[PDB]
Ligand binder design. Structure first.
Ligand SMILES: [Mg+2]
Ligand SMILES: [Mg+2]
Ligand SMILES: [Mg+2]
Ligand SMILES: [Mg+2]
Ligand SMILES: [Mg+2]
Ligand SMILES: [Mg+2]
Ligand SMILES: [Mg+2]
Ligand SMILES: [Mg+2]
Ligand SMILES: [Mg+2]
Ligand SMILES: [Mg+2]
Ligand SMILES: [Mg+2]
Ligand SMILES: [Mg+2]
Ligand SMILES: [Mg+2]
Ligand SMILES: [Mg+2]
Ligand SMILES: [Mg+2]
Ligand SMILES: [Mg+2]
Ligand SMILES: [Mg+2]
Ligand SMILES: [Mg+2]
Lengths: 128, 112, 125, 63, 236, 109
RNA sequence: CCCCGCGGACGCUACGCCGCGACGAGUAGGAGGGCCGCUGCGGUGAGCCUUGAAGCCUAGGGCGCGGGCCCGGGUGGAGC
RNA sequence: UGGGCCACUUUUGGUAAGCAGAACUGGCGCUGCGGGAUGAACCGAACGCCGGGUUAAGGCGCCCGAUGCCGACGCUCAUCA
RNA sequence: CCCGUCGCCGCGCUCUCCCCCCUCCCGGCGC
């Protein structure tokens, strides 16, 4: 059916849940975006048990499967047909996806061009 | 004394330590002693050019014990299987520290 | 010089596309479309490249000559190959291997010729 | 844990010129290959000097 | 083409040393010092087209994928399943009574015939007794009861191999888009052959079972655990 | 036509006092109350069979409400029966004190 | 002085790619990297946009250790 | 940064102090983790994200993982053990 | 050149000839 990648390794994620900021639940003024707690008495910064986890370099993903989409592919944002042509010779590890601003009639031509170039599009039906 | 346990290893204890956990210090790296050429390359000038020569220079403390021993990376043993019955007192008072003469061999079997 | 001109355009060029964890080059004769000294289609004394034909069928392989290295009007020769898939692949293989014309882009050119050729082949239902 | 001091782990020395002179980069490339692929220690000294800063390359008077 | 000339006392070790084998192989006297087609030529097919066409076999590919994968390193072990060693449990011996644990014949007690070349056990229920035909079973999903029948002097037919017992299939001939459904073969057919082999095996295994008392009744029953006994305490 | 599995029970996860490791679970098998008695079960496949609302597909049968979390016995846990087992996914805490089946699957007897 | 043959994967943005070994606590503080983010200027993308820009909403799909980002649907109506 | 504090041992003033002042080493401050039910400093051990195995100090009636050993030898009755 | 069943290490057979024991398309078979 769809275009298969060159290789499909098992993608292993050391953590799937998001790193939420300390005390982001107690407030609406505090967004989920991570902030390192620089407080003298902070128990999250001190890394007490049962507290909110702090992100660090140990959670980094494997080189091999980093940035891979859940189907064997890596993303690349295209805005016109010319940017599609650059993915002709990868074609098996990178998939195009159309930017949000591209108009309905223009992205139809992008979808048709990728189909005959054997390029996988992550959003091939997005203005219909 | 309160930080080490030591003793007098026998031939079998030297054999198992070198063969199972023998890592060489080559180019400041920790290379496993998987082939004889790895020892002959660095200890060849002293006549120690295989594993068996390394056992013989260590067990029978030879003229080049210092070179053969320092070539060996310090052995990374596991925790003693079956416990150690103490850690803070001397061996002769029921503990672990100090010199157990020939009982280091029993510890080595459980340690690696 | 290729090495001197490379150090000028290796990071500052009009054809450079730097996007999410990837880089690409959009210059005309860059097979594999990647930012690289080997595959750059502008800085080299000799370069090879293939393109789809102006019509719907065939592959146009363009070879840079040596005399007019400074004159871009006549610096490239292009030939249109419009035979079967096997015949064109052998023809472009001969055009690189036998001429000894940059024999490091041989498989880059043959692979690109294959990708262009099956793109021209009609989509089945 | 192993007891060691990690303050002297990172050796502080030039691994490349801090300049963006493409002509100095080019002959650094040339002398990086020569030092790697020859046993000459002259190329090693020259290569490490090409990395050095201007104050570490004082002008040499003709006399 | 002699035999090994070196008996094995432990795997990886030979009985005799290099010198001992040198004398046995007599390499003292037998010492030895010193000592297509890519294209075919088809005929012309003229006339006046002369010159026979040298036509090459193994022609060049007409298409190349944009990317290839590097070849794997070499493994020095890892034989395929066809040439593995088949290990058979020491408690399982031809003629023993097994207990099927998993399949549709869960808990049935069947008699164990020879083992197949794929490691699967060829067991039969005496089909008349417990409705288990000539059917393969896995060594690991059975229980070896200590009850045996001497099935020495039995003729198991030669064509009772794994290829014989391998499952067959029908779908799907010339059909890709399935809208008219294959309303047949849902009845797997017990081929007249299988009925004959089953008749041959059981007729020469049934009297040997009737010989020892109430073995027929034992085989008709199913194994089960009650609110009493526990498997680690049971003797089988 | 028979029970065909030994009835264990889910006692909790392997734990310290204030740290609990949910990836392994401790099982109490009926009739085994010493370590030497656990050697029979030391590799047997275990199952946590439960029901839910939505029908799920059933191998060899029509879809129904019965679900299972599979696992197997890893080793013995301490001086008196008390096998510890590993499941394909960590068992829910709701299963503590409920039935775990030990299947007599892969058998060495 | 290869060849019945005319052939033989990938690579090397050298600021790149590859190999091996050891190591990984941290306030005050110092340094590096940031294809983290905001606004404006010079170049550049024969870039995007009334066949719908910004902004906003989202039980939608994802990527990144993270800062954050991309994409789908809705609203919006002129820029980015 | 130039407010320090604590523990073993040595030690001064004081009846003494979770007091005041010194010496040495370690620690807390700057540090999370296992144990002491609880705890800045005690005992063990220092920390990237994980799986398996084994230990430290400490424990194994139940809370609460582990003695559900046919554990060994004694001692002890408390109407505040 | 149909896809390196490859390196180190440890072995077996053959390019020598005799024998012995189970065998075998077996040749007819009395087993
Ligand atoms: Mg994430
Ligand atoms: Mg919030
Ligand atoms: Mg504090
Ligand atoms: Mg143990
Ligand atoms: Mg102490
Ligand atoms: Mg540090
Ligand atoms: Mg560490
Ligand atoms: Mg750090
Ligand atoms: Mg919008
Ligand atoms: Mg102050
Ligand atoms: Mg004081
Ligand atoms: Mg410190
Ligand atoms: Mg601490
Ligand atoms: Mg604690
Ligand atoms: Mg207390
Ligand atoms: Mg662990
Ligand atoms: Mg307790
Ligand atoms: Mg308990």
């Amino acid at each position: 059916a769809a275009l298969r990648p060159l290789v499909k390794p098992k993608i292993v994620k050391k953590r799937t849940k998001k790193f939420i900021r300390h005390q982001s639940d107690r407030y609406v003024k505090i967004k989920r975006n991570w902030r390192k707690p620089r407080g003298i008495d902070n128990r999250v910064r001190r890394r007490f048990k049962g507290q909110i986890l702090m992100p660090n370099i140990g959670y980094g993903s494997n080189k091999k499967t980093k940035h891979m989409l859940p189907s064997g592919f890596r993303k690349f944002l295209v805005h016109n047909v010319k940017e599609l042509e650059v993915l002709l010779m990868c074609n098996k590890s990178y998939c195009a996806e159309i930017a949000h601003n591209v108009s309905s009639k223009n992205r139809k031509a992008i979808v048709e061009r990728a189909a005959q170039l054997a390029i996988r599009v992550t959003n091939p039906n997005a203005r219909l | 004394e309160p930080y080490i346990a030591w003793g007098y290893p026998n031939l079998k204890s030297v054999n198992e330590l070198i063969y199972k956990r023998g890592y060489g210090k080559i180019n400041k790296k920790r290379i496993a002693l998987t082939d004889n050429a790895l020892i002959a390359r660095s200890l060849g000038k002293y006549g120690i050019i295989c594993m068996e020569d390394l056992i013989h220079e260590i067990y029978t403390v030879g003229k080049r014990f210092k070179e053969a021993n320092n070539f060996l990376w310090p052995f990374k043993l596991s925790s003693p299987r079956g416990g150690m019955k103490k850690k803070t007192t001397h061996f002769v008072e029921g503990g672990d520290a100090g010199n157990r003469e020939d009982q280091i061999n029993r510890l080595i079997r459980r340690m690696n | 010089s290729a090495h001197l001109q490379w150090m000028v355009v290796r990071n500052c060029s009009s054809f450079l596309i730097k996007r999410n964890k990837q880089t690409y080059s959009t210059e005309p004769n860059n097979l594999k479309a990647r930012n690289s000294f080997r595959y750059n289609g502008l800085i080299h004394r000799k370069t090879v490249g293939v393109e789809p034909a102006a019509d719907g069928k065939g592959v146009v392989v363009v070879i840079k000559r040596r005399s007019g290295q400074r004159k871009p009007a006549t610096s490239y020769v292009r030939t249109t190959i419009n035979k079967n898939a096997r015949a064109t692949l052998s023809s472009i293989r001969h055009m690189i291997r036998k001429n000894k014309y940059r024999p490091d882009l041989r498989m880059a050119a043959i692979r690109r010729a294959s990708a262009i050729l099956r793109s021209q082949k009609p989509v089945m239902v | 844990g192993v007891d060691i001091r990690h303050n002297k782990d990172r050796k502080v020395r030039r691994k490349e010129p801090k300049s963006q002179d493409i002509y100095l980069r080019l002959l650094v490339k040339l002398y990086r290959f020569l030092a790697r692929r020859t046993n000459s220690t002259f190329n090693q000294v020259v290569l490490k000097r090409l990395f050095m800063s201007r104050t570490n390359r004082p002008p040499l008077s003709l006399s | 083409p002699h035999c090994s000339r070196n008996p094995v006392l432990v795997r990886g070790i030979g009985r005799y040393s290099r010198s001992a084998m040198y004398s046995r192989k007599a390499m003292y006297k037998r010492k030895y010092s010193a000592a297509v087609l890519a294209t075919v030529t088809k005929p012309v097919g003229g006339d006046k087209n002369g010159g026979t066409r040298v036509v090459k076999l193994r022609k060049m590919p007409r298409y190349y994928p944009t990317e290839d994968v590097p070849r794997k390193l070499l493994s020095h072990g890892k034989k395929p399943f066809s040439q593995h060693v088949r290990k058979l449990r020491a408690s399982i011996t031809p003629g023993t009574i097994l207990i099927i644990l998993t399949g549709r014949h869960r808990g049935k007690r069947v008699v164990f015939l020879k083992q197949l070349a794929s490691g699967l056990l060829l067991v039969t229920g005496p089909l008349v007794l417990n409705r288990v035909p000539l059917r393969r079973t896995h060594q690991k999903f059975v229980i070896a009861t200590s009850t045996k029948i001497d099935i020495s002097n039995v003729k198991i037919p030669k064509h009772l191999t794994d290829a014989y017992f391998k499952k067959k299939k029908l779908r799907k001939p010339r059909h890709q888009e399935g809208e008219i459904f294959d309303t047949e073969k849902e009845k797997y057919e017990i081929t007249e052959q299988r009925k004959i082999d089953q008749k041959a095996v059981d007729s020469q295994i049934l009297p040997k079972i009737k010989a020892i008392p109430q073995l027929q009744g034992y085989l008709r029953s199913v194994f089960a655990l009650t609110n009493g006994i526990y498997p680690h305490k049971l003797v089988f | 036509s028979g029970r065909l599995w030994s009835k264990a029970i889910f006692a909790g996860y392997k734990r310290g006092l204030r740290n609990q490791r949910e990836h392994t679970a401790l099982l109490k098998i009926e009739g085994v109350y010493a370590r030497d008695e656990t050697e029979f079960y030391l590799g047997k496949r275990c199952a946590y069979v439960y029901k839910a609302k939505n029908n799920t597909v059933t191998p060899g049968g029509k879809p129904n409400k019965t679900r299972v979390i599979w696992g197997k016995v890893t080793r013995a846990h301490g001086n008196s029966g008390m096998v510890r087992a590993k499941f394909r996914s960590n068992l829910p805490a709701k299963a503590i004190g409920h039935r775990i089946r030990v299947m007599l699957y892969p058998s060495r007897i």
